[PDB]
Amino acid sequence: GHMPLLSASIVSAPVVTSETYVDIPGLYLDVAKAGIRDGKLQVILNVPTPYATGNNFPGIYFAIATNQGVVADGCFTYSSKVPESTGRMPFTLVATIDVGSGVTFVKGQWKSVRGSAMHIDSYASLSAIWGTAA
Amino acid sequence: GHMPLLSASIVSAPVVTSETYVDIPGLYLDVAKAGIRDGKLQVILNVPTPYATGNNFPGIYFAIATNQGVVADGCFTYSSKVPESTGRMPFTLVATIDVGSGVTFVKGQWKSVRGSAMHIDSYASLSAIWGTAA
Amino acid sequence: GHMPLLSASIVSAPVVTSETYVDIPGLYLDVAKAGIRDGKLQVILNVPTPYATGNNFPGIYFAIATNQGVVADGCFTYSSKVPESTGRMPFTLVATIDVGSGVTFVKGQWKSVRGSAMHIDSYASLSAIWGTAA
Ligand SMILES: CC(=O)N[C@H]1[C@H](O[C@H]2[C@@H](O)[C@@H](CO)O[C@H](O[C@@H]3[C@H](O)[C@@H](O)[C@H](O)O[C@@H]3CO)[C@@H]2O)O[C@H](CO)[C@H](O)[C@@H]1O[C@@H]1O[C@H](CO)[C@H](O)[C@H](O)[C@H]1O[C@@H]1O[C@@H](C)[C@@H](O)[C@@H](O)[C@@H]1O
Ligand SMILES: CC(=O)N[C@H]1[C@H](O[C@H]2[C@@H](O)[C@@H](CO)O[C@H](O[C@@H]3[C@H](O)[C@@H](O)[C@H](O)O[C@@H]3CO)[C@@H]2O)O[C@H](CO)[C@H](O)[C@@H]1O[C@@H]1O[C@H](CO)[C@H](O)[C@H](O)[C@H]1O[C@@H]1O[C@@H](C)[C@@H](O)[C@@H](O)[C@@H]1O
Ligand SMILES: CC(=O)N[C@H]1[C@H](O[C@@H]2[C@@H](O)[C@@H](O)O[C@H](CO)[C@@H]2O)O[C@H](CO)[C@H](O)[C@@H]1O[C@@H]1O[C@H](CO)[C@H](O)[C@H](O)[C@H]1O[C@@H]1O[C@@H](C)[C@@H](O)[C@@H](O)[C@@H]1O
């Protein structure tokens, strides 16, 4: 159609620790397949129910990446060194990409805060709305 | 218009406890009334300042529902069994619905984590952007 | 173009305390410049990695404002009087503005919860998608 909305969603990912960004499997939008080659994409990475396990102020970094690498990043962290319980910390990240540059895909990634294990066990999404410059 | 944006917003809701999803009153989009019958809707449920009261790791589940039921859901929870103070835990949930299936409305819902009372006493919104497949 | 997306992003702001909303420098969209004069804007304020310092349940209020003042606001706050460590508390706020009113700009603002110092030291964005009424 003339006003493309892209969406991918997951309900889980294998629990891993990583010092550097690794893909969140399944949060991937094939932009080239959509025939988006010019304009802008507003991309939302929505991880509403994550938690992190660890023993030194745990948390998770998340990123929106294209084939050109990370475009935006943010994290949550707990406020106790060893939380009584690793509570659910909703996380949203929003970035606008110029597709002209040579973007063929957008994806979600994550990485450990201070050696934390990274947990998704319910709904998470990666969404993009296509538009133009003003 | 040719590029509809739907929006509903509230500033409060009666405080309730519920084991199962109940509507957040006022967070409701009448899609049929808009004449949306085909394409996709990106729906954001934005509850930026909620809190939960309770005695067993309190929190709130939130959902986006259509007439076909829940499409996505997430929660926040505290990281203490009995928080010193029930702090404000911003919550965002994003989902993309294919409208063809027979969607006439989109709404926000909530339900208790472990018997928590659910509090909204400031701005919350439900938004939707209409588009098409790629 | 015929389907504008507006975007502004920062990576930091001078740390300040403020009893009333002050601008988050750099989170500002010039809507008049875009030639948006009618329809709707869905505006997201995305502050994914903030923290607050203070000694009385710290937190930050955030707002979306136009030339007509604040349209929506929300806050995060910690659940301890003096957090062990001021953890990162992702914050998103979404609002839909009718541009006809006389809107020339949209901006993000913030203010202190109970005298908190307000910290941004990584990516934050302010985004807007243009549409029409249904
Ligand atoms: C609240 C929580 O984290 N629940 C976890 C649980 O954590 C337990 C520890 O916090 C523990 C230390 O003793 O105290 C509690 O458990 C005690 C007791 O030990 C237990 O035997 C007894 O039956 O209950 C008491 C209550 O005080 C904590 O509850 O760890 C286990 C790991 O085995 C689970 O992850 C549990 O997580 C929950 O599991 C549920 C199924 O029983 C269900 O799926 C819940 O949704 C899930 O909780 C959610 O995820 C958690 C990681 C957390 O984020 C919570 O806020 C979420 O609601
Ligand atoms: C977790 C944290 O807050 N890290 C801050 C750090 O805070 C230290 C203090 O909080 C301290 C008590 O006041 O506890 C720890 O430090 C102890 C000890 O006191 C210290 O001397 C020793 O080296 O380590 C131990 C560990 O128990 C806290 O670590 O203060 C420093 C210096 O001022 C930093 O801000 C640190 O922030 C981290 O800094 C990193 C760069 O070195 C990096 O940039 C991290 O991203 C950043 O942490 C993040 O921001 C924090 C403010 C907090 O939000 C954390 O959750 C984030 O991950
Ligand atoms: C810090 C807080 O929660 N204040 C909140 C207070 O909570 C206390 C708690 O601090 C501690 O001492 O334990 C006792 C008993 O458990 C209380 O729970 O209770 C007060 C009395 O009802 C209020 O609820 C107070 O809430 C604040 O009230 C002021 C005006 O009185 C403003 O309206 C604040 O905005 C409001 O704080 C906001 O909501 C509270 C629930 C919390 O989310 C704060 O982080 C938040 O800023």
Author numbering:
A (entry chain BBB), B (entry chain AAA), C (entry chain CCC): -2 to 131
Passage from the reporting paper:
We also determined the thermodynamic parameters for the interaction of rBC2L-CN2 with Globo H. This hexasaccharide contains the H-type 3 antigen (Fucα1-2Galβ1-3GalNAc), previously shown to be recognized by BC2L-CN in cell binding assays and in glycan arrays. We measured a Kd of 26 µM, which classified Globo H as the best ligand to date for BC2L-CN. The structure of the H-type 1 complex belongs to space group R32:h (H32, a = b = 42.7 Å, c = 308.6 Å) with one monomer in the asymmetric unit, whereas the one of the H-type 3 complex belongs to the C2 space group (a = 74.4 Å, b = 42.9 Å, c = 102.6 Å and β = 96.0°) with one trimer in the asymmetric unit. For the structure in complex with Globo H hexasaccharide, the four units were modelled in every protein chain and the fifth one only in protein chains B and C. No electron density was visible for the reducing glucose, which, likewise, was completely solvent exposed. The following N-acetylated sugar, GlcNAc in H-type 1 or GalNAc in H-type 3, interacted mainly with its acetyl group. In some chains, the acetyl group’s oxygen also established a hydrogen bond mediated by a water molecule with both the next glycosidic oxygen and the main chain of Thr83. For the remaining sugar units in the Globo H structure, most of the interactions were seen in protein chain C and are depicted in Figure 3F. The O6 and O4 hydroxyls of the fourth sugar (Gal4) made a water-mediated hydrogen bond with the main chain oxygen of Glu81. In the α1-4 linked galactose (Gal5), only one interaction was observed between the O6 and the side chain of Lys78 from the neighboring chain. Those interactions with Gal4 and Gal5 were not seen in the protein chain B as a result of a different orientation of the O6 of Gal4 and of the terminal nitrogen of Lys78. In protein chain A no density was visible after Gal4, which presented different torsion angles than in the other chains, resulting in a more solvent-exposed sugar.
BC2L-C also presented at its N-terminus a domain of unknown function, which was later revealed to be also a lectin domain (BC2L-CN). Establishing a new lectin family, BC2L-CN showed specificity for fucosides, especially blood group antigens, for which the measured affinity reached micromolar range. BC2L-CN was the first lectin to display a trimeric arrangement of the jelly roll fold primarily observed in tumor necrosis factor α (TNF-α). A novel binding site and binding mode for fucosides was also uncovered at each interface between two protomers, which implicated an essential arginine residue.
